[PDB]
Structure formats: structure tokens, C-alpha cells
Structure 1
Amino acid sequence: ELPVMPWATSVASGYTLLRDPHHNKGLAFTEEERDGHYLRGLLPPAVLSQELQIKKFMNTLRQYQTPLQRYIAMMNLQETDERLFYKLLIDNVVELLPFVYTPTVGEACQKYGSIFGRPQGLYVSLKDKGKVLEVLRNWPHRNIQVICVTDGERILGLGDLGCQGMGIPVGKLALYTALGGVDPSVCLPITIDVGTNNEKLLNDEFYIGLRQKRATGEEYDELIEEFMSAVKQFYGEKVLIQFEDFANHNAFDLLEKYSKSHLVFNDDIQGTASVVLAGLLAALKMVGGTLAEQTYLFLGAGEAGTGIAELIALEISKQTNAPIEECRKKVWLVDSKGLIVDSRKGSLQPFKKPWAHEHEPLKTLYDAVQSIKPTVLIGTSGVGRTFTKEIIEAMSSFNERPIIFSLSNPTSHSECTAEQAYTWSQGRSIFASGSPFAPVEYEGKTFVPGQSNNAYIFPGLGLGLVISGAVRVHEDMLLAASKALADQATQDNFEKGSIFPPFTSIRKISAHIAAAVAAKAYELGLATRLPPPSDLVKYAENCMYTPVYRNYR
């Protein structure tokens, strides 16, 4: 006895067909399609193939001089011809990923109100309190399997962008489709608008959100609770909810509460941890060594930092068979007050305590790098230019091949650049970054730095959950995904300095990740699509959305 929306169904014809992104083929409508659907005359005589349409659009797209104009033309395409959008992205993913994802999506979010054109996603605000379920009914695709949701509090390293954070889930789900093969009709981008503490946006006449400060405490928790309950009631038990770009306290609390009642994943805490782990398994495959033999130092000890560290420690426990507390002993984190150490146990946030070992207090990253002498440095602070020449030279002075992960996004917030990491280390850093850098020529050799970004993981991980009918996420699924990504890494990639295969392999990578995730769901008793298929890799491959145009009756 929920209220229901009454939907009418009809055959799309004429301009109705041309104006529906899900069906519009533009000039690719065939002769017969045109004569059966009243398109004759509404289009010019010539029939153009999907492949020529891609070429035409790529031609005009490269004439836009700024990355933001290219993001704009891509989103406009997504909202006019969805299959072309996805075939174009897939076939040009290496070139286009920086424009629809990091870094450009970050700029899109900062300027979202000033470029806002065709509506994308669903906005749920404080003003919908008591009527969330009401709002969800307005979404015209009934069969939702993947939700990506943000409150915009922590967009990349750019801070609080409020209701303009919508570009992040819209981005993420396009990658679920393009990289992961998830059907776009079952994807739902959501922004929850509870206000913003961003003064500049509160005073901007184009800000698209509620002009108030962020709600906190009960007012916030009640809205989230109503949302999560509405999702369960409307979409069932198997809907994947992916949390994106919440602040530390909220992100942890949400994962703690809803991972017992729903199928949830936090991309920053769990996705990032998984991709970094894979990058470490591959880095050790190129330069030798075990995960247990390393000493880890993190700059930044919130969601991503502590989550990556926990996953690394967890995999150390699996490979050594030692208790988890032992496996944390060579993982150290530095926050804004400095090294996290026993003498501060007095007053650390809960998620940092397990990392506080007995050690002298140290104020700065540089002093901690000097005293701890890590084999591995991982930056997630969200603060640019924080891996200095002095730091990379130190890391290069006491390791032959220092592993440097500069994970903060977008590009301007990167801890260092690939250029700086290879030069300041004399060609010896194993380097990966959150955001893309071009190849670096150093002293006559080419380095191709891998992008340690959770886009390698979430698309296949989510596909794995969906094809298996998983109802909960378990940490062993994260380790299974990390291992499936590292296992795709080859000698070809390593010779170029790349810890990951390139994104031209992404569909195949996603199919192996999904297969390993699904297998793990079956093994733990968390899968509801029983029985398992006979070949999970083949099944994942066969499940994947293809954006080649349909023929229409």
C-alpha cells in the first residue's frame, strides 16, 4: 500500500523518438526505421553509421579549447543520444576519461551552477523531508540496481561544493556503464542537498542548491535514514548503494549503520583501498618483495588513508597468517598534527587509534620520512605539493625503488606530479597517481605512470555484486578484487613503469574483477543468484551492456 505512480506505455515515434536519449539514433535511423516511425523529412536524406557519428563528434570535440567545454559537450551528448555517448567513450576512453572524470569533473562541480544545462540525476533535499519516497517515484526507470549518492561535502580535494557535487555520481555511473558494462537504465545518480558551508556558493546567484548552512546531528541523520529506508522499500534488498564524497565522520557512520541492513560500498574508504592494494601487489611483482616486508607511511589519515591501511594490514594477515594487530606494526600515518603515535592516544578520533604505535612524536612529514624510512609513501591528504623535492630525494636516498602513490585529486591537488617524482628520484620511483599525467621522458627513457584511481575497481566490483545477487559487501570481496586487478598487470606494462594495465583493457579487467567478486559472494553465502553459472568470467562478459544501436520495429 505505498502510493504508486501510474505510467502509460506507448510506441515512440516522430519527435518523441528523436527527443528520447535512450532511443534516439540521430542520422543513424535506417530507411525502414524512418518509414515505420514517421521520421521521413524530420531528418535529412543521408543515413550515417554509428561509427561515422563517433568520428564526427570526436572531430568537433577536439576543436573545443578548454577541458570544461569538452565536459559540457559530452554531457549534452549523454542527454541526447545515449548509445552514441557510450560507444564514443568506450572506443576513446584513454583520451576522454580526463574530460568526463578527474580532473575536469572537479571543475565541472565547482562551476556546476554556471554551466547547468540538461538535467541529470535525482536531487533529494531537506525540503523533501517526509516525502523522499514521493521524489523517487518521479524517476522514469523503475528497475534500479545501482545508486551512486553524495552530499557534496568532500568533493575530490576541493571541499564542500554542496548540491553542485552531482557531477561526481553522474560521472561515476557513466563509468559503471562504459568501463563496467552496467546497463545505464538501471543506474541512478543522486545528490542529497542538506545545505553547504561554502560561503562563495551561498552568495552565488547561480548556486543550484538550498541557500543555508549544512544541517548536522538529528536533522541530518533523519533525512539519511528516510532516504535509505525509501530506497529499500522502493528498490528491494539487492540494490547497490555507492557512497561518494561524504566527509570522514559521516562516511564512516553511514558505512557502519547501513552495511548491516543494505548492500553498500563507500568508494573512498573501500574502492580506493582496493585499487591501492592492487597497485602494491603489482609494484612488488615488478620490483620483488612481499607485502609483509614493507614499511608504509601515509600522508593523510581520514577515510581513504585509514581504509587503505586497514586493507593492506588485512592482506598481510592473510599472507602471513598472523593476527591483525601484528600486521599493522609497520604502517604509519601522518595527519595535520603530525605522526600518529602512542603518546597521542589521549585524543585521536576512533578510526586512527589502531595506527598509534610507540614512537617519538614528529611534527612534519619530512621528519617522519627521515625517522621511519618507509619503502612506501602514500598521499591522500587532498593538499597539493606536499611531496616536496626534499621528501622524494629522501625516499630515493634509502630505497633503490621507492614506491610513491600521489592519490589526491584533481591534478592541482596532487601531492606531486609524475615529472617531479621521476626527476627528483633519478628515474627510480615506482609512481602512481589519482589523476592522469602524461608520459615523462627522463634522461632518454619513457615512463608511463599508472593511475591509482578507484575507477579500475568499482565498475567490476559493482558488476560482480549485481550478477551474483549479493546482499552485503564483505572485505574479502575487496581483496578478491585487488588480486584480480594485479593479476592483469603484465611485463608490457611494467617495462613502461605502469603498475596497472591501460584503460583500453578495462572491460576485460572489469569482467575478471566481477567474476572474483561474485565467486567470493557465493563462497561466503552472500549471493542470491543460485546456482552459480558454470564460468563466471564468461558470464560477466556476456552480461555487459553493449552500446551498439538496436534496430527498431
Structure 2
Amino acid sequence: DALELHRFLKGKIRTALPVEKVDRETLSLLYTPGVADVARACAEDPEKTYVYTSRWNTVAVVSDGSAVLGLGNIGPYGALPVMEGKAFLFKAFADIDAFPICLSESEEEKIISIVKSLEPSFGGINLEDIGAPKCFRILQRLSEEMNIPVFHDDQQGTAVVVSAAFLNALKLTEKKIEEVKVVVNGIGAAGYNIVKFLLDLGVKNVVAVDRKGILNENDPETCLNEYEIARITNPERLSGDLETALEGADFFIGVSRGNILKPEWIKKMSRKPVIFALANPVPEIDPELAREAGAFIVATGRSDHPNQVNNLLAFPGIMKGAVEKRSKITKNMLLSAVEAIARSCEPEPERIIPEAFDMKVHLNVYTAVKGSA
């Protein structure tokens, strides 16, 4: 039981000085008068912090608690434990020293001005559970305005894993990338990014579907906020609801709500339809019910079913490789991670991508992101 095992532990984070015992000598070196010469050093040249501090291995897990898991805007106090969670995964899978920073400030322009000032302390930032659409502007501004890498799982993380899964499934489907119809349901924090990736990779006919049906420039009803996606998708200028968009569709990438895709609409999709029902905790459609309705491949966000698509397969490596290469996170480094993950296994219907525990993946990703631009 979760709750008990927490109060027991009293936190999932800890520190630990390198040395075992301290005496007149140790101070003289790790502190004044000794460390004085490390300041002179790091001040005269900042890169030196990556050689004398932990800076080369530290990452800040920043959240305001505006979109904690599937709970909503519960706040920073409720997000704290979830951020120690991410901090743990960072240490466990990338040996990164991640420190959870939960801010009590929701105004986007201030979140940005606050994090920018943290740069001297970390080698990278990891925006976590920050609501949409403000997470879009925050991510963009920060990655541009800061010299250390800035990543946001729910957005870029998801997009990386999904693309990988997509690529492998596409191979098994044997269809041409520039000829398949992919329906993306739920254009939120993940949705938005997922579309752009599919476009980048090479998909041509992508149809965005949200609360108001197919996103179409023409029907401004569907164009809720300035997120644009309608102008770069839906080439057959389609129009209608989800059921309408699934006609002849080859892939369904749902990242919205549960039980909204009716088993019978699957038979209206082209041969061998791929179904990514990544909604938590309840998937767009039950995995088993989809196999029965005629799904060639099925994937969810849950662990109790085959083909789990979760960021864990992408952020440990990406973040480590970018924080070491001391560089910003570029589309090239993200695409390499997509390829990295994808080739980290031989694809098969019940295994299109590896599990987060395959330590080979994290090395392949760390390797790619590192060597990438």
C-alpha cells in the first residue's frame, strides 16, 4: 500500500556526501580556505561548474501542480510527492541527481521569470505536470531563453515514445508512411506535439479530432484556442465527428478520454487498423474489445496490457544525453531518440516497442541524444 510505504520512508529523495568522515583537513579542501579557489575558477569561467560541481549531473523537476497526473490543478503541495516520483525515476534509470521544485505561482510570465533564474544551479530542467495551453508558451520561451536543456515529458516525452511505437507498427502494417490516414483524438498537451511529429516524420493525411469534432479551418467551432493544427492537417478537408474521421483511417492515436471509441467503428477503418488508446486511466476503447472488433495492433498507456507506451522509455536518456552534451534540446535530438527507441527491438504485434525496464533502451537513447545535434 502506497500511502503507508510513503510515511514510512519519509521521502523518496536523499543526499549523501562523498567522503565518510570530516576533520580539519576535509574542510580545508571542500570548504574555506580551499573552495575559494573553485569560486575564483567557476566565476572566471562558468563551464567550469560542469567540472567542479554536480552541475553536469543535476536536473530540476519543475511543476506548479496545474495538471498533476489525471487529477487536475491540485496545486504544488499535491504535486510535490509526484515530483519526488519523477526525481526517483531519474536516479534509478539515468543515475541523474534530480531535485523536485514545486512552485507556488500559476501565472505563466512569472513561472518563466522564476525558472530562468535557476539556471546557475542545474544542468537541465524538466517541466512536469503543468497545464495546457500555458505549458506551450512556457516550454517554448524557456527553451529559447535558457542555455541548459528544457524538456517537458507530457509534451515532447509522449511524442517521442508515440512516434517510436507508430514507426514500428507502421512497419508491421507494411503501408507507406506518406500514404496512411492517422486520426489523432484529443489535441491537448500531448495531442498537439504528436501531430507535429507525425508530420515531421512523413505522414501526410493526419486528421485532428477534439471535443468539437474534426479540426477544420472552415468550421471555426472546432478551432477552440489558437492551437493552428487545423491549418497544417486535414488535407482531404474532411469534416464531422470522430466516427466520420475514422472512415478508411489506418491509425487511431487517442490521447483523450475513456470509452469514446465504439468497437463497431473499427470495422469502418482500412484493413489492419492500428489502435493506440493512450488515455489514462481508462483507454479510449478496451484493449481486448479492440482485438475482437478487428484491430491488428493495440497499445495503451496502462501496464496491464501489451505494448505500453510511456515516457519512461524516453526521458531518462534524452535528459541525460542533453545535460551532458550541455546543449539545448533540438528536433534532431528528439528524432534520434525516436529512431533509437524504435530500433531497440524487433517489432511484433504484441511487442512493438520494449518495456521501460530494458536497460538497453536507455543506453541506446542516451547514445543517440548524445551524438545528435
> TM-score by structure 2 length?
0.80
Offset of residue 458 of structure 1: 0.6
Query: Structure 1's 278 and 151: CA in aligned 2 closer, same or farther, altered over 3 A?
Result: same
Matches within 5 A, 1:139-538: 143=55, 145-163=58-76, 164-179=78-93, 181-183=94-96, 186-194=97-105, 220-232=107-119, 234-235=120-121, 239-262=123-146, 263-316=149-202, 329-344=204-219, 347-351=223-227, 352=229, 353-355=231-233, 357=235, 359-362=237-240, 364-370=241-247, 373-381=248-256, 383-395=257-269, 398-399=270-271, 401-409=272-280, 411=281, 413-425=282-294, 428-438=295-305, 449-470=306-327, 472-490=328-346, 494=348, 497-505=350-358, 507-520=359-372, 524=373
Query: Structure 1's 258 and 151: CA in aligned 2 closer, same or farther, altered over 3 A?
Result: same
Offset of residue 358 of structure 1: 5.5
How far apart are the structure 2 equivalents of 1:78 and 1:310? 41
SS at match of 2:246: helix
> Partner amino acid for 1:369?
L
Q: Report the counterpart of residue 137 of structure 1 in structure 2.
A: none
Query: Structure 1's 228 and 348: CA in aligned 2 closer, same or farther, altered over 3 A?
Result: same
SS at match of 2:179: coil
How far apart are the structure 1 equivalents of 2:3 and 2:279? 21
Query: Structure 1's 337 and 73: CA in aligned 2 closer, same or farther, altered over 3 A?
Result: same
CA contact (8 A) 1:147 1:188 kept: yes
CA contact (8 A) 2:59 2:125 kept: yes
> Partner amino acid for 1:404?
I
> TM-score by structure 1 length?
0.55
Query: Structure 1's 172 and 333: CA in aligned 2 closer, same or farther, altered over 3 A?
Result: same
Query: Structure 1's 76 and 393: CA in aligned 2 closer, same or farther, altered over 3 A?
Result: farther
Give the stretch that moved more between structures: 299-308 or 160-169.
Answer: 160-169
> Partner amino acid for 1:169?
M
Query: Structure 1's 81 and 312: CA in aligned 2 closer, same or farther, altered over 3 A?
Result: closer
CA contact (8 A) 1:477 1:517 kept: yes
1:238-278, Cα deviation, whole Å (9 max, x unpaired):
x2111122222211101121111222112122111110110
CA contact (8 A) 1:342 1:357 kept: no
How far apart are the structure 2 equivalents of 1:462 and 1:176? 9
> Partner amino acid for 2:330?
H
Offset of residue 419 of structure 1: 1.9
Offset of residue 488 of structure 1: 1.0
Query: Structure 1's 72 and 250: CA in aligned 2 closer, same or farther, altered over 3 A?
Result: farther
> Partner amino acid for 1:334?
V
How far apart are the structure 2 equivalents of 1:81 and 1:358? 52
CA contact (8 A) 1:276 1:308 kept: yes
1:435-477, Cα deviation, whole Å (9 max, x unpaired):
2124xxxxxxxxxx1111111111111111123222x111111
CA contact (8 A) 1:156 1:408 kept: no
Query: Structure 1's 463 and 142: CA in aligned 2 closer, same or farther, altered over 3 A?
Result: closer
How far apart are the structure 2 equivalents of 1:82 and 1:229? 25
1:173-226, Cα deviation, whole Å (9 max, x unpaired):
2222222x223xx211122233xxxxxxxxxxxxxxxxxxxx5xxxx1353134
SS at match of 1:344: coil
> Unpaired runs of 5+ in structure 2?
16-52
How far apart are the structure 2 equivalents of 1:419 and 1:311? 28
1:469-510, Cα deviation, whole Å (9 max, x unpaired):
22x11111111001010101225xx26x111123331x2110
Q: Report the counterpart of residue 49 of structure 2 in structure 1.
A: none
> Partner amino acid for 1:342?
E
How far apart are the structure 1 equivalents of 2:185 and 2:98? 34
How far apart are the structure 2 equivalents of 1:344 and 1:81? 50
Q: Report the counterpart of residue 50 of structure 2 in structure 1.
A: none
Offset of residue 345 of structure 1: 5.1
Q: CA RMSD in A?
A: 2.5
Q: Report the counterpart of residue 546 of structure 1 in structure 2.
A: none
Query: Structure 1's 504 and 271: CA in aligned 2 closer, same or farther, altered over 3 A?
Result: closer
How far apart are the structure 1 equivalents of 2:68 and 2:175? 35
SS at match of 1:333: strand
Offset of residue 148 of structure 1: 1.4
Query: Structure 1's 74 and 515: CA in aligned 2 closer, same or farther, altered over 3 A?
Result: farther
Offset of residue 406 of structure 1: 1.0
How far apart are the structure 2 equivalents of 1:510 and 1:360? 40
> Partner amino acid for 1:349?
N
Q: Report the counterpart of residue 93 of structure 1 in structure 2.
A: none
SS at match of 1:260: helix
Q: Report the counterpart of residue 5 of structure 2 in structure 1.
A: 73
Offset of residue 357 of structure 1: 4.0
Offset of residue 158 of structure 1: 3.2
SS at match of 2:177: coil
SS at match of 1:355: coil
CA contact (8 A) 2:108 2:138 kept: no
Identity %: 28
CA contact (8 A) 1:341 1:357 kept: no
Q: Report the counterpart of residue 33 of structure 2 in structure 1.
A: none
1:76-124, Cα deviation, whole Å (9 max, x unpaired):
44748979xxxxxxxxxxxxxxxxxxxxxxxxxxxxxxxxxxxxxxxxx
Query: Structure 1's 433 and 467: CA in aligned 2 closer, same or farther, altered over 3 A?
Result: same
SS at match of 1:450: coil
How far apart are the structure 2 equivalents of 1:388 and 1:158? 25
Aligned residues: 329
> Partner amino acid for 1:407?
L
